[PDB]
């Protein structure tokens, strides 16, 4: 549920605050959807499903993950590579917007307004560097990827 | 508070602040007429010193209040109809009102030159 | 709350506790216990 996305956001903040080169997440399709969007937006370096121990650092892309079955699904985890440029984490802040207590949904015209830096609904306008990820019927997208495809949906979190 | 606590009515109006002139603020009136029950003197509190000319007025609404008499020298006394407005004497406790100088029986300061509109003083007309 | 301010509540609670003991008899006559 949305609680896992909320844990994924606070965990990545703590892993970047600690300047960790790697970090693990519970293996769920929802966490994978947000991680693929962060990687697609350029905030993380890699995504790899593995066990409770991180794969070999050097051979990370050519890593061969074993098939996921009911005999090991309980130990699978998503390993994320974190970026740090100019003595600063590239994924500094991950502020959630929709929470377990309330799921915030935005319309296409509200996202068009938030994309240019104007408040709309419970959201606020985006500034230089900030990003916004929306969970739509076309997958987890960035607010500028959503307005291009002309869809709304559930707002997940704002990435500074 | 949580969304559930707010939905049940946790947000309530803040406790009201007492007005400067409750006898006028309670009924939205700018001024009220009254009869002078007593005309005497009040003593300021610790810092200031002197004798403040005050009057015990019985408003047309029934309330008995203490009003400050602005200016130097007055004409009202017992059984005198005067107009009361808001504003208080800061150093006098219980004096939460002022008397209008151009009122019914209270006269304006005769030898007043500056701020005549505050003391109900007609222009000397010495030029004409 | 500091000890200085708690002593203000300490006196207000003792004065009240002392008032009820004193007027307990007349409150018992008027059926107000």
């Amino acid at each position: 549920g949305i609680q896992q996305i909320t844990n994924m956001c606070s965990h990545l903040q703590n892993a970047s605050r600690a300047r960790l080169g790697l970090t693990s997440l519970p293996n769920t399709k929802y966490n994978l959807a947000l991680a693929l969007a962060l990687h697609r937006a350029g905030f993380i370096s890699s995504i790899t499903r593995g066990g409770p121990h991180p794969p070999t650092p050097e051979a990370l892309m050519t890593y061969e993950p074993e098939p996921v079955t009911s005999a090991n699904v309980a130990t699978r985890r998503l390993w994320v590579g974190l970026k740090y440029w100019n003595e600063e984490p590239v994924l500094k802040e991950l502020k959630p917007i929709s929470k377990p207590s309330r799921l915030v949904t935005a319309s296409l015209e509200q996202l068009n307004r938030v994309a240019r830096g104007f408040p709309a609904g419970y959201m606020k306008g985006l500034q230089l560097g900030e990003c916004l990820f929306v969970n739509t019927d076309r997958g987890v997208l960035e607010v500028r990827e959503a307005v291009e495809r002309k869809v709304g949906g559930l707002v997940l979190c704002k990435v500074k | 508070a949580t969304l559930n606590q707010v939905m049940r009515g946790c947000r309530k109006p803040q406790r009201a602040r007492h007005a400067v002139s409750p006898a006028l603020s309670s009924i939205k009136s700018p001024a009220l007429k009254g009869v002078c029950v007593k005309v005497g003197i009040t003593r300021p509190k610790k810092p200031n010193s002197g004798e403040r000319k005050t009057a015990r007025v019985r408003l047309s609404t029934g309330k008995v209040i203490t009003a400050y008499i602005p200016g130097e020298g007055h004409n009202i006394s017992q059984h005198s109809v005067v107009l009361v407005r808001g504003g208080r004497a800061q150093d006098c406790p219980g004096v939460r009102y002022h008397l209008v100088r151009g009122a019914l029986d209270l006269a304006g300061v005769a030898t007043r030159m500056s701020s005549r509109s505050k003391y109900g003083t007609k222009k000397p007309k010495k030029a004409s | 709350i500091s000890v200085r301010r708690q002593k203000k509540l300490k006196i207000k609670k003792k004065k009240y506790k002392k008032l009820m003991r004193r007027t307990r008899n007349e409150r018992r006559k008027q059926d107000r216990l």
């Binding site: 960790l20 080169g21 409770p52 121990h53 003595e87 | - | -």
Partner: protein
């Protein structure tokens, strides 16, 4: 946060920006520091990032929530098990002084343990037996015990000749008019004499304290 803000990694970025424009608007900027162009193309290296350290030993597979992932691991070699076995069977082999000071770090270039225990550059020590044992136990397929006995016996025959040569070398020297200085057996005893005396003085001076304080314990000062 008691620590201070160190911006040592951004001296170039900060210095290059301050030199871009002139403080007196309307004039060309002055010449920058002389070091600005020197490190123009030598940026600092990334610091404070915690990577997955080298795993010198296989990590515990049964662990489901492992801790200390960013902690360096202990370096262990197959020889550690062998060194502990030898030096526990030969404790007095640790009394032979060994120089762990390096000369040029090129010791392992002339070590061919297929020949024997005597190599170039290193002395005949318990390490030679461990390296010779490991070679036999890996190449000739011997077992831990078999390879141990072989390299161990070769090591004894060499030590015996070293001790037999000291005695004979001194015995023949005197047969042709050769005399030597004091030996450890004599020097060692003289040092004990000088130290034994210091104890005698302490005991003699410390016993007088007890006998005096003991006799004075009773309050016999009346002198009846």
């Amino acid at each position: 946060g008691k620590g201070r803000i160190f911006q040592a990694a951004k001296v170039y970025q900060r210095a290059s920006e301050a030199a871009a424009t002139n403080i007196v608007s309307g004039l060309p900027p002055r010449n920058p520091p002389l070091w600005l162009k020197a490190i123009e193309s030598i940026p600092p290296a990334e610091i404070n990032t915690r990577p997955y350290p080298i795993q010198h030993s296989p990590p515990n597979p049964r662990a489901r929530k492992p801790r200390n992932l960013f902690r360096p691991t202990k370096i262990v070699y197959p020889e550690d098990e062998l060194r502990r076995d030898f030096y526990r069977d030969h404790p007095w082999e640790l009394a032979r002084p060994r120089m762990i000071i390096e000369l040029d770090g090129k010791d392992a270039r002339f070590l061919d343990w297929s020949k024997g225990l005597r190599q170039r550059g290193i002395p005949l020590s318990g390490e030679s037996v461990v390296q010779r044992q490991l070679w036999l136990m890996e190449n000739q397929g011997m077992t831990k015990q078999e390879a141990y006995d072989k390299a161990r016996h070769e090591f004894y025959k060499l030590r015996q000749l070293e001790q037999m040569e000291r005695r004979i070398a001194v015995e023949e020297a005197r047969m042709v008019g050769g005399y030597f200085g004091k030996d450890l057996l004599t020097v060692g005893m003289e040092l004990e004499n000088k130290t034994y005396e210091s104890w005698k003085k302490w005991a003699t001076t410390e016993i007088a304290r007890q006998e005096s304080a003991r006799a004075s314990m009773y309050t016999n000062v009346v002198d009846n």
